[PDB]
Amino acid sequence: REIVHIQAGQCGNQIGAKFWEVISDEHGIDPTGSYHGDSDLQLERINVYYNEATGNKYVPRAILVDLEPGTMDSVRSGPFGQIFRPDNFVFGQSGAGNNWAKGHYTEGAELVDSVLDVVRKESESCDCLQGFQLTHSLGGGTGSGMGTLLISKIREEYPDRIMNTFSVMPSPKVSDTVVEPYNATLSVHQLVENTDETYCIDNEALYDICFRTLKLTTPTYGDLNHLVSATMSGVTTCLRFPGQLNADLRKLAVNMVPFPRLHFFMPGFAPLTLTVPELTQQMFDSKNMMAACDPRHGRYLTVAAIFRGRMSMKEVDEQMLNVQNKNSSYFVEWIPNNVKTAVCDIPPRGLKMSATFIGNSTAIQELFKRISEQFTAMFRRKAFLHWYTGEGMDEMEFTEAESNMNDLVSEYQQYQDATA
Amino acid sequence: MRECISIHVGQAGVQIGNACWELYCLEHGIQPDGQMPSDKTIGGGDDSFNTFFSETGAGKHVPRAVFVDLEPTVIDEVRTGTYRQLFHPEQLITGKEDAANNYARGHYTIGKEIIDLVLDRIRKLADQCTGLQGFLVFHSFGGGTGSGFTSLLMERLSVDYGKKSKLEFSIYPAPQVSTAVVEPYNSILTTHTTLEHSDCAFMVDNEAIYDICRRNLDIERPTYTNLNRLISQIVSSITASLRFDGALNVDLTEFQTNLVPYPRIHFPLATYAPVISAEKAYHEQLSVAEITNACFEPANQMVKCDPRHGKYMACCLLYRGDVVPKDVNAAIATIKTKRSIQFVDWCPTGFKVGINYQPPTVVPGGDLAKVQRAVCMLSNTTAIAEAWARLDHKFDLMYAKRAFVHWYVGEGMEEGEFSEAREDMAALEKDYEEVGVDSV
Amino acid sequence: IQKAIEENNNFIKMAKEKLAQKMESNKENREAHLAAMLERLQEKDKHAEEVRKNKELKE
Numbered sequence A: 001r002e003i004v005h006i007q008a009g010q011c012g013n014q015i016g017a018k019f020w021e022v023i024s025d026e027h028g029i030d031p032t033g034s035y036h037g038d039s040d041l042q043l044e045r046i047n048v049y050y051n052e053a054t055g056n057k058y059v060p061r062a063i064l065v066d067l068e069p070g071t072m073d074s075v076r077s078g079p080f081g082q083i084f085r086p087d088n089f090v091f092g093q094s095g096a097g098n099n100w101a102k103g104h105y106t107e108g109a110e111l112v113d114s115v116l117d118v119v120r121k122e123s124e125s126c127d128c129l130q131g132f133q134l135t136h137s138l139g140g141g142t143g144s145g146m147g148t149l150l151i152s153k154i155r156e157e158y159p160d161r162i163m164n165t166f167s168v169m170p171s172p173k174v175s176d177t178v179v180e181p182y183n184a185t186l187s188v189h190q191l192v193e194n195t196d197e198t199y200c201i202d203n204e205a206l207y208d209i210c211f212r213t214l215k216l217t218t219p220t221y222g223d224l225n226h227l228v229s230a231t232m233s234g235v236t237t238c239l240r241f242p243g244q245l246n247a248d249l250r251k252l253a254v255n256m257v258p259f260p261r262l263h264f265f266m267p268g269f270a271p272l273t274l275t276v277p278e279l280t281q282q283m284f285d286s287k288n289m290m291a292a293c294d295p296r297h298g299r300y301l302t303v304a305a306i307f308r309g310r311m312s313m314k315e316v317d318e319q320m321l322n323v324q325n326k327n328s329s330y331f332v333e334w335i336p337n338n339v340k341t342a343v344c345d346i347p348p349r350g351l352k353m354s355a356t357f358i359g360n361s362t363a364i365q366e367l368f369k370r371i372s373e374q375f376t377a378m379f380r381r382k383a384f385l386h387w388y389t390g391e392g393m394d395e396m397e398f399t400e401a402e403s404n405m406n407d408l409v410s411e412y413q414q415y416q417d418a419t420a
Numbered sequence B: 001m002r003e004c005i006s007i008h009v010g011q012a013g014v015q016i017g018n019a020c021w022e023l024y025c026l027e028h029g030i031q032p033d034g035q036m037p038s039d040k041t042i043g044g045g046d047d048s049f050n051t052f053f054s055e056t057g058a059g060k061h062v063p064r065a066v067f068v069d070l071e072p073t074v075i076d077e078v079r080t081g082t083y084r085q086l087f088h089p090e091q092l093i094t095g096k097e098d099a100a101n102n103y104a105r106g107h108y109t110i111g112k113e114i115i116d117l118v119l120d121r122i123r124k125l126a127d128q129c130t131g132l133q134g135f136l137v138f139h140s141f142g143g144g145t146g147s148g149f150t151s152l153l154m155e156r157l158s159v160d161y162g163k164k165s166k167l168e169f170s171i172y173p174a175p176q177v178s179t180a181v182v183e184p185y186n187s188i189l190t191t192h193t194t195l196e197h198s199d200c201a202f203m204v205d206n207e208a209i210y211d212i213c214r215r216n217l218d219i220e221r222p223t224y225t226n227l228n229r230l231i232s233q234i235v236s237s238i239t240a241s242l243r244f245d246g247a248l249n250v251d252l253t254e255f256q257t258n259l260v261p262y263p264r265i266h267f268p269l270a271t272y273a274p275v276i277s278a279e280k281a282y283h284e285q286l287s288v289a290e291i292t293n294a295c296f297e298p299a300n301q302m303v304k305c306d307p308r309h310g311k312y313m314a315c316c317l318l319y320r321g322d323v324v325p326k327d328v329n330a331a332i333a334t335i336k337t338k339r340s341i342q343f344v345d346w347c348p349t350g351f352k353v354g355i356n357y358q359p360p361t362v363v364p365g366g367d368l369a370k371v372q373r374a375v376c377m378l379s380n381t382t383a384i385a386e387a388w389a390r391l392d393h394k395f396d397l398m399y400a401k402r403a404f405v406h407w408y409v410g411e412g413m414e415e416g417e418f419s420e421a422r423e424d425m426a427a428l429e430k431d432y433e434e435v436g437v438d439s440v
Numbered sequence C: 001i002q003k004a005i006e007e008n009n010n011f012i013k014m015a016k017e018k019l020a021q022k023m024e025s026n027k028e029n030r031e032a033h034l035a036a037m038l039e040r041l042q043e044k045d046k047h048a049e050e051v052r053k054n055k056e057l058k059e
């Protein structure tokens, strides 16, 4: 069961690089692709993310994409820059300029076919292809625009495969670019229709965690990515190690997605820098959510919890039952036993034990309402639309994305108000 | 003759197959390489253990079994495990992509790609039988393979083998060890589809086994290995009449005549005793009367329900070990006067008894103490309908909102199959109500 | 004994026919779901062509 990784744009390649650094360390892979670990559990499911080559080399099954070379040139100079496959680098020169239309319809449409060639090359050699996981942002041009274009074109050639995306939501607290509410809404319009599961990485939640919790005066992108890499490692633990629960992308989607459009998850992590009760309590706390949403303002449809480290599984079972009973009001009654828990003995780097939270909560509408509020403020006065219509789009397409995202919030509220 | 073929489907069925055949080998003195020194007839035989084991010219005793899973992880462990020499490679059949806890993929999308090969391999085993008696199908309700593929296979077996008997060992889902939210869906779908193709089904409630392992064996968090080793003892008690022979031995089909009063009422409740740890069995010997009385304690049942609040349609006691009828009759007479044993008015109230003198066996390094005498009670009680009720309620909660239904429709199924399957379950619940009402 | 043979044969027949009906209806439904999925994606390509064409005309 192989997974094909794709990172597009500045944000996508930066968080994608960190993701490969963290899991390569967990699986005992060095920047040269060699294994120097001490446990056979690091290699049992190494084929999910790594291809084996000559000399027992493990090459990440990753595809690096961007409309400008600078961000990807830094990756090749990074710690594990030499571990990636050189032919899997597909970059242009014109760039996107934070223009969704350029990435989706114009400049990215020219580069998309050269990316598909690398996808087919990697996918053809898969013994049993699971699907694809994409890392990108929704507030840029390449990651938001060309990233959503690649999803549609890939789904056309692999309609029976799972499409997973690590989407980074824009926040004015981190980026001052003003056309980001446009790029995010246009991307969400595409993600609702062509992805099976999407992790919402909200930069507003990352900033608030770094500032309020971690006590950081000026959070750098490296600080935010430290939370992203730790989160991405947790939500993929069930895929990378021998496990019973949510061991692959399809079984995860079956347990997490009760309705096809409601596939936007709320990630959480603990500890943010300790006993099992504390881990369980912090894990369900709004201050530990990587999406700026309060779960107590909505109801959980489905939840996946991953505990890592050496601990008492009897205690984990008792505490997970305890939090569901003391917070029953926030779990929909019409989906019995909607909280599944997995335990991996191998903790992350530098931690005795951790906990990763994957929630499908109707409160995620708070995130889509924030972007919708920022969107309509500019669209009702038709501001900055010439950058998009100049590339060929029309106002009709902007209104469709607005209504489709407003429908998503209405549906999240619909099942929040539903009763048994 | 009277051979029985075992089919193990999915992770649950396969991993329980490992426990059962390991236990079988220990009971008959068969080594992991299949050699059986006590068997003096080389290359063949008509002994009682030949109902479950075939013999090669080289003296290997080969299980009459097929293992099927739509992914290779679980069966690969058998191909490289301790008893790997026990099975011919063609008995272990694997795919590449599993059913993802989706009945539709197990019955249709993925299952249809391997169903012909499985039937072909089953045919090879049937051709070795001089008088095939029937099949034993091990599977879960919750998994996409255990539910979807098993239903497809049961349908095909009815076509290729007519009304030849087919018995099920079904793993009823429990939240402590379940791995999918849609297990109620897969349960109702497979029960509806297999109802007319099964002659007798022994349900095993994982929560019941989970509680027994925690309560009686002091296991804080039981694993599948803990549960399966207990399940194998119940399976062994049920099949002991087929694998051994004795004067007081009573064939399983003879119990089956008493257990199934109507075709759809073929779900016996199993209760096993004694389940005790070595530390508590030391210097404590449990008599016939004590283990028999434990059969009427609801905490020892394979399915959680209250037979005190139902009516009996049959009661069978399968003893094994140091047991004589005198002790059995006395224990039963004492129980009749101190238990809530109410029979329906159209059934005789006698208890059917079988005894297999072969003592119980334990897997080395296990949690179960080795005892001199054990018993499995097979009773047909209306109370088992409670298991259908709890499961049907979970189905109704999700299906009222059509939660997760798109995963099944996307694989080619229709809502009509959900409503049709649920209606059959409603009729089944009504069937168990009707059989308990007094006659005019 | 003729009745027992006929009933067993009719059971085998009904089962064989019931199954072939389900497997064919399932095949058509799944293919139809995939064909609709591709048709929608193919309409996004037609729209993308019109968008690039619409840009060519403005200039």
Ligand SMILES: C/C=C/[C@H](O)[C@H](C(=O)OC)[C@@H]1C\C=C/C=C/C=C/c2nc(co2)C(=O)O[C@H]([C@@H](C(=O)OC)[C@@H](O)/C=C/C)C\C=C/C=C/C=C/c2nc(co2)C(=O)O1
Pocket: A096, A097, A098, A099, A100, A176, A177, A178, A179, A180, A384, A387, A388
């Ligand atoms: C002149 C102003 C002087 C001010 O006193 C002062 C300053 O500057 O001195 C120090 C402040 C400095 C404080 C904060 C900066 C904020 C930036 C915001 C920014 N937003 C975009 C670009 O910068 C954007 O969104 O531009 C798009 C292009 C792009 O994104 O590529 C770069 C295009 O390609 C994408 C098309 C879809 C085209 C579409 C719309 C552009 C709107 C202009 C916003 C703006 N605000 C200031 C300056 O400009 C400002 O307030 O500045």
Ligand SMILES: Nc1nc2c(ncn2[C@@H]2O[C@H](COP(=O)(O)OP(=O)(O)OP(=O)(O)O)[C@@H](O)[C@H]2O)c(=O)[nH]1
Pocket: B009, B010, B011, B012, B013, B015, B016, B069, B070, B098, B099, B100, B101, B102, B106, B140, B141, B142, B143, B144, B145, B146, B147, B171, B172, B173, B174, B177, B178, B179, B183, B206, B224, B225, B227, B228, B231
């Ligand atoms: N008692 C017992 N139950 C098991 C075992 N393995 C899985 N289960 C139960 O079976 C259900 C899940 O079905 P599985 O058998 O694992 O899935 P499957 O049959 O392989 O089907 P797919 O994997 O979806 O293709 C859950 O309710 C589990 O609790 C086991 O070894 N013993």
Ligand SMILES: Nc1nc2c(ncn2[C@@H]2O[C@H](COP(=O)(O)OP(=O)(O)O)[C@@H](O)[C@H]2O)c(=O)[nH]1
Pocket: A008, A009, A010, A011, A012, A014, A015, A096, A097, A098, A137, A138, A139, A140, A141, A142, A143, A144, A168, A169, A170, A171, A174, A175, A180, A203, A221, A224, A225, A228
């Ligand atoms: N967390 C995080 N967010 C980033 C990073 N780089 C850019 N972003 C976000 O991405 C958005 C801009 O998109 P960007 O990736 O730079 O444009 P692209 O190159 O066209 O994909 C902004 O809202 C940024 O907050 C990063 O390294 N980490």
Ligand SMILES: [Ca+2]
Pocket: B039, B040, B041, B042, B043, B044, B045, B046, B055
């Ligand atoms: Ca012999």
Ligand SMILES: [Mg+2]
Pocket: A010, A140
């Ligand atoms: Mg940028």
Ligand SMILES: [Mg+2]
Pocket: B010, B011, B071, B098, B143, B145
């Ligand atoms: Mg399986």
